[PDB]
Each structure stands twice: as structure tokens, then as C-alpha cells.
């Protein structure tokens, strides 16, 4: 409704609805809340992130939380999170943005050195390698975008 929408519009929004509104919000109001909300609990935030709803919730919530919080806190939260969902989400990622690649950095931090799957990891290798290659290609394309002796002349004129 109009009242709750303009409450979302106005910055300050005190405590309890910020605590648990996401469960209630899980359409148009959901978009408005994610694009503007002063306080967002990382639990529900990463749960919605890892939901495969993917109406560009990925990019939206990623840029949101990256503007909102700290990489260390994120890493702790998604250590507390499970890893199966991590695998599925990164599978979607490698199948097919600086926000999401920063999330890739973060999730590698969270996972550390233990849980990795060989073939999946090699698929990641190829994907990331080709995407690198194209990226530096884009770099030189940018930078390029940013970029006497008449010893004897056998000539003539039209008099």
C-alpha cells in the first residue's frame, strides 16, 4: 500500500520490521524494499541472494550488500551458511558484474582451502581464464580509444 511504500521511501525505519520484514516481502514492494532499506540482516540477505529466483536479484542484492557491509562480516556469515547452495550458485555463475566477481572473491575467502570439487574447479579455471583474456582485450581496446625529398620528379601540369 501507499503508506508502507512511502515508509520504505523515507530513510529511517526503526527496528522490528527491519528485523523481520523480508519473510513477509518474499513483488513490487519486494523490489522497493531491496532497492531502499536502511537495515538489512545478513542472514536473510544472503538467503535471498542465494535463492535462484534470479530476477536480477543477484546484481541488485549484491550491489546493495556491497554498499552496505564489510567483506569480513560477509565472509563470516557465509561461512555460517552451508556449501551446497554455494556450489549451485557458483554453477549458475560459471554457466552465465564487478559486484558478482567481488562476491566470487568473497566466497573463495569463506571456503578457504578445504571443500572444492575437481571437475567443477577446472570448469571454473577455463571460464575464468577465457573471461580474463577477453577482459584484458577490452583493456587495450580502451587504451587505443584513448589514443621532403624531390630528387627527381616526373610530373606534369594542366596549363
Amino acid at each position: 500500500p501507499k503508506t508502507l511504500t512511502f515508509l520504505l521511501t523515507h530513510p529511517l525505519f526503526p527496528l522490528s520490521r527491519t528485523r523481520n520484514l523480508l519473510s513477509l516481502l518474499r513483488p513490487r514492494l519486494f523490489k522497493q524494499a531491496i532497492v531502499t532499506c536502511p537495515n538489512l540482516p545478513l542472514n536473510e540477505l544472503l538467503e535471498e541472494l542465494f535463492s535462484i529466483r534470479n530476477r536480477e536479484l543477484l546484481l541488485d542484492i549484491s550491489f546493495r550488500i556491497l554498499q552496505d557491509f564489510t567483506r569480513d562480516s560477509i565472509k563470516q556469515e557465509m561461512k555460517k551458511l552451508s556449501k551446497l547452495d554455494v556450489q549451485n550458485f557458483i554453477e549458475f555463475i560459471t554457466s552465465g558484474s564487478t559486484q558478482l566477481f567481488q562476491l566470487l572473491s568473497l566466497v573463495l575467502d569463506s571456503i578457504g582451502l578445504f571443500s572444492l570439487e575437481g571437475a567443477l574447479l577446472e570448469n571454473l579455471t577455463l571460464y575464468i581464464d577465457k573471461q580474463v583474456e577477453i577482459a584484458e582485450r577490452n583493456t587495450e581496446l580502451w587504451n587505443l580509444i584513448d589514443t621532403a625529398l624531390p630528387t627527381y620528379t616526373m610530373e606534369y601540369l594542366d596549363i
Partner: protein, 99 residues
């Protein structure tokens, strides 16, 4: 040090320090944080007496100051806000936005 690299840029910041040398008040845009000098982290409320480490305000903060161990003075381009520190409640509000 305490080095976060947020993917956003705010040209407006402020910060203040308690006389004790232990309580540090960093007002980054729209939010103040209290940090311990010894840990450079949010002052966790083990008692949880509504002394939340962050204050999210009406507007982006341009000025912070402290007069004593008691009173914090924060200017947002809309308002001036005087907040008590022993009791975490805003004492005074002053309309500045038209000016």
C-alpha cells in the same frame, strides 16, 4: 588501521574522539559508528541496553563533535541533532534545512 573498501564513495565524512582515548565516533555518510580504540570494532553491547554501536540518521552526516562525556552534536544538512550518550536518545532537534 581499519581498512574497509566499500564500492561506494562519499565525499562527506567526520569523526570525533572521547577525551578518555577509548571511544571513537566515526560518522560516515548517513551512519555514525562507535569503535573501541583497542579493537577498532563496534562497541558490542553485552548488556544490550539499547546502546547500539551504529546510529543511522535522517541524513548524511557532515559534522560530528562532542562537548563532554555526555553530549554529541551532529549536523546533517537538514538538521542539527544533540544526542545524549549515557541514555541513547536524541535530546534536541533543530531545523536547519531551509538555511
Amino acid at each position: 588501521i581499519s581498512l574497509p573498501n566499500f564500492n561506494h564513495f562519499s565525499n562527506s565524512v567526520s569523526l570525533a574522539w572521547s577525551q578518555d582515548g577509548s571511544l571513537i565516533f566515526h560518522g560516515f555518510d548517513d551512519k555514525l559508528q562507535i569503535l573501541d580504540f583497542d579493537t577498532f570494532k563496534k562497541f558490542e553491547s553485552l548488556e544490550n541496553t539499547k546502546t547500539v554501536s551504529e546510529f543511522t540518521l535522517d541524513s548524511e552526516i557532515q559534522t560530528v563533535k562532542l562537548i563532554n562525556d555526555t553530549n554529541l552534536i551532529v549536523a546533517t544538512r537538514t538538521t542539527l541533532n544533540a544526542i545524549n550518550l549515557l541514555r541513547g536518545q536524541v535530546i534536541n532537534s533543530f531545523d536547519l534545512y531551509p538555511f
